[model samples]
Target chain A: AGITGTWYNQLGSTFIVTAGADGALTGTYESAVGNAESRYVLTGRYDSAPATDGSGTALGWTVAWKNNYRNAHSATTWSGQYVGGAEARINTQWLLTSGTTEANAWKSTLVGHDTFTKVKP
Target chain B: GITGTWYNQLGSTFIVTAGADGALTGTYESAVGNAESRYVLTGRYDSAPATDGSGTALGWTVAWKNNYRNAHSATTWSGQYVGGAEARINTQWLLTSGTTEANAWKSTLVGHDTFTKVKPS
Candidate 1:
């Protein structure tokens, strides 16, 4: 029931997650958008385990990119749930942001979506 | 179910449920690489299900404290429940960062994501 497996999004941003109740979530984000292929440390907590049944739970997490500095070294957060049905899905919304540098700072926040399913769970 | 735990593609967990009077009392926890704080979510929900069968049309605002920037920032989201074999919340959000309008106007951002429910299949 733990979400410990390889997962990929629609955009091919894939990673293998090692999740546990006693520790943080860790993975390597092969991000198609950033072209960053490296191991990344993710901070998150899952109070509920993702199940195979049609049930849901709420959780939150984030990642602050440190390596392969892109055009902007951004920090992103994911808010979502692990939904189980015929297939399991990690559906979520995201906020990926860089810097404001005193300019229009609010404009820097980017909100979006991605449904993560398993590649090798 | 209109009221429950929901997760997003990015990384956050929303814990909410509906009241008979159409009030939504919930917590919006942002995991910006860490679960910094559980912010309060105050919003309204339509008692009737959406025409598209997306459960309830809901909207909420969050005045963040101890957030990603540890600054004065806020966001608003409007979305509806998407019920199917798998469930999710299709939504759009406008985020305004910073404490002043001069910077807030420039940093104001808009985007979309779907938060998934636990029930489906």
Candidate 2:
């Protein structure tokens, strides 16, 4: 997803999530104004298996995001599950490391939930 | 499950996921809130297995992520996965530095797969 634009407290940014015909999603991010160069990108399969939370209404397509962000050169794996409803609710978590640490060294618990919506193309 | 609110083209700035002990699953992301600073705060988590076209599911569960934000302190590694996904995905990658051009560096990917997800928490 290619994202750009100013944000208050880094909260405002746009990204482009393009889906390939093969069901793969490629994301590209862009920085707005002073925030540039920290290019983030990712490519993964859109897994919609079993496709439900048992109730079987809309598919709760789970998005396990294997992504890369900022100048930290390493892949941080995470997962986000969305039911594709009004909430566009997702549950995700990943590691938060200090700058330039190895993949296996001082690390902390980065945990939380996120709600998102698709405003436009 | 605590998520703060914000705005952007990507939709409302919030987080995703559910439950306690969920970390055992080896996946997570933070919710944007005061904990993550107003700039941003979020974590992600979830775990399953990898698969192939044969429909035979692999016993291996691998998770990867890339995330970063200005809402955290500088120079610290925090996060987990695998038999250790309970903490955060830790891979020894680099050392910590201040927010200046002095410590600026770039990537030269290792191995075949792209190092995608990362976060400077």
Candidate 3:
């Protein structure tokens, strides 16, 4: 089964991700930071692998979104795992550049430990 | 009416207010020990008086997510009204991830505190 629909992050932020038959993924991220809420469009890929947590078969995904938190068009990369359905665990890191290329800047620092809970199918 | 400013023994504060249809909403700012955060809280009255004789503490459960990080467990304040102007809330926060469980009612123990309604100035 493919992962699709609106998902929520830890802060009540939202991500709407859609997966295609070729393992291609696309989505939009929305969140309220301070007094302003912004949405970012994202794209990525999903791969199936053994569960690192020993929870059985797991699905892994790597996605990127642009212009997060109004960071001058900064980009964010989210690497996550889904065990089965309606639940996913993700770790996010930030990149200062909005260009398609990823940078090594602040590779040691993570934005947060995030989760995607299905809100709508 | 339960709509008023409340202060806890630890100096945290919650400003509660009701909507047009008597729906409850509030802002909670708490900084106790090593834990400090703020949230825009929302919930309803599970019982008419929010008492404890129902064996479930006769309390209203108010839940909120972190404003910024948004990754702390979804937190709830289950409060029992006492003596007309006081309340004692048992806080339950779940660290688990999943839209079905998070939006619903699954919780783990976090902490507890007592609150006093502030007299209008």
Candidate 4:
């Protein structure tokens, strides 16, 4: 389909994006950083309507940082587009921000990118 | 409680404090070994605190001091936490500097860092 499957990256992390009801996007992310063996919750939505064929459709997701007692931790959002063919992949660019303040009124925003391929569809 | 220390697998340090309304103020010490430096950091942790600090989204950003290579370079990270004995922050990041280049895109340096929350004894 479009973005409904278990994807893997070179970094050894796992990410799954599925449909909720209509156009809602539901997913999970597990990072291999530090040999982590746990999964984290992921939230985001499809930029367009549902699609069966994955190509040229923009879809993305975001994750929030959790510290238990306090909810205010940090958050990251990813914007991606599906490129389907022989080797299907989700080309994504992400942003992680804390906010702006006086002492540190935010000089700039942190950014990065990742490419994911289907491990399970 | 939301204020603490986190260390990425790259040996970089992320320290910040949760302020009013999810404002995060901290510092990011780069350990890239490619002429890195510590810079003022800011971000947001605007989510409900999970019992185990799970399901929360977070992100942070920093403006490179231009003390090294590219001028006006900066980075931002976004992701969630893996709560437990070690609340993990496995976030992706993009380090961008300069304006647009030849490839019809800006300078996009990408990476995924698995950050682990730590406390001193």
Candidate 5:
């Protein structure tokens, strides 16, 4: 029931999530890329009471997310699975929508993954 | 009943809820020009005494993660109030930390949005 804390990923990124008593969740994602760090604001809900992905698998603790920075596509979804109740593996695909450089502005839809370990604050 | 569903004029959706202990949480989807924006939003609204003259007290400060863009912001929804069956929030997007993308990201995005309580079905 306590899904609120900081999670560290394999890529040196940090995700901080806060769970509300209402079963709703929100947080931030921070990853250090070279000398710069990438961060994202996140929001979602934690459905514990009969929380199954429409498939009665006892997966009553899954979470979903998306970055809010697009205007021409279905925002990439970062779906996460809470394994062992303390570790979360989030998967998604990234396509660079825009960038300072034309080359950087473009990207192929590529698979991206991040493994997170809960570090309570 | 601060927990339920909400929608913006753009057809974007927000599902939110609050608890007796003053915890607010929810999920949000911002539709960009009829496109399913690639980024989804999840977050919490920290409870604070309302600054407006509503006299009821109970305002919320927000922090969210954009999992797609890989950035975050500590935004303030000043002049917010939920009266009867409707709520209004004046969002002040402020960036406290993150990458160059985050810095440049919120540079031009600032303002507010009105939130109406979703009638229970």
Candidate 6:
């Protein structure tokens, strides 16, 4: 039962890795920072690093996602892009940064994390 | 009048699309394995190649969207992440895995499709 989309963090930010036909996960993101808003695609995968022990059954696939929103620090101005995915399968190991640079770069950086389950599909 | 978001599927996965203040058609998605959800959005697209029509339409152009809770799916999830113009749209579409190759890549891809019209300048 790999956890489908539906994961959010504090700050009201969220991420989703919807699965395609052949177990391929697509990416989608949503964020609310001040007047700056963002909704972009993220590289998605299912992290199967951890599993159940008792019955030795598969637990779930972690949704490791990363999407960067160019923080212009404006009342409503965010630019740049994000790029991050899961490790191995779909482990939730995300690293957020201002694109590839930070020193006087395109924008600032923020981080978010959490887990989810499959309510439907 | 073009189709607004509000489609369904066999196993319920959905998709959607719409327009912003104009004649632009956007996209969206949802699913219940085969039917639709009640009190949805309480609820809540993409591509050019497989789009059968126009594609590549989305950005932080609009305000934003709420969270993805079961409030719309089960009619019981407590407070909703509803607010402002963000709670104005409810697009949906439904694609299946039994269709054409390109179209059937995703299962129950029920979601509309849309474009944003950033008011004024």
Per prediction, fnat is 0.00, 0.04, 0.00, 0.21, 0.05, 0.00
Report the lDDT of model 1 for residue A85: 46
Chain A TM-score of model 4 versus the true structure? 0.74
lDDT tens readout by residue for model 4, B19-120:
665556677776553435665565656545435423345666564552443234445566555455666665666654433223316445777777777532
Fnat for model 1 comes to 0.00
Q: lDDT values of the candidates? A: 0.55, 0.25, 0.40, 0.57, 0.36, 0.25
Q: Which residue runs does candidate 1 get wrong by more than 4 Å?
A: A33-39, A49-53, A68-71, B1-121
Off by over 4 Å in 4: A1-121, B31-36, B50-53, B66-70, B104-106, B118-121
In model 3, residue pairs whose N, Cα or C atoms come closer than 3 Å (at least 3 residues apart or on different chains), thus clashing, are A10-B70, A11-B70, B51-B58
Q: By TM-score, who's the top model here?
A: 4
Error of 5 at B86 (Å): 30
Give the TM-score of chain A, superposed on the true chain A, for all candidates in the order listed.
0.77, 0.49, 0.59, 0.74, 0.51, 0.42
- Clash count (model 1, backbone only): 25
Sort by DockQ, top down from the best: 4, 5, 2, 1, 6, 3
CA RMSD per model (angstroms): 19.0, 18.6, 19.1, 14.1, 15.4, 16.5
What is candidate 3's CA lDDT for residue A48?
A: 25
TM agreement with the true structure for every prediction: 0.45, 0.34, 0.36, 0.46, 0.34, 0.27
DockQ of each: 0.03, 0.04, 0.01, 0.10, 0.05, 0.02
Candidate 1 vs 5: which has more lDDT: 1
User: lDDT tens string, model 1, B7-104?
Assistant: 77766778887667445567887545356667656554555442432244455555454333333344556555546577666666655443221232
lDDT of 3 by residue, A1-121 (tens): 4367766666767767775554344566676533333765454444322224323121222222224234322223343344344344442222111211113222312233455656432
Model 6: what TM-score?
0.27
Backbone clashes per model, in order?
25, 89, 3, 37, 27, 63
Q: After superposition, which runs of candidate 2 have C-alpha atoms over 4 Å from their true positions? A: A1-10, A30-36, A49-70, A73-75, A97-104, B1-121
Candidate 3 C-alpha lDDT tens digits along B1-121: 4577777767777777644432345667764422346654543332222132321111122223332433322233333333333343322221222223333233233344556675223
* lDDT per residue (tens digit) for residues B17-109 in model 6: 323321122222234332323111111112221222212212111111212221100010001111134222112222111122132223122
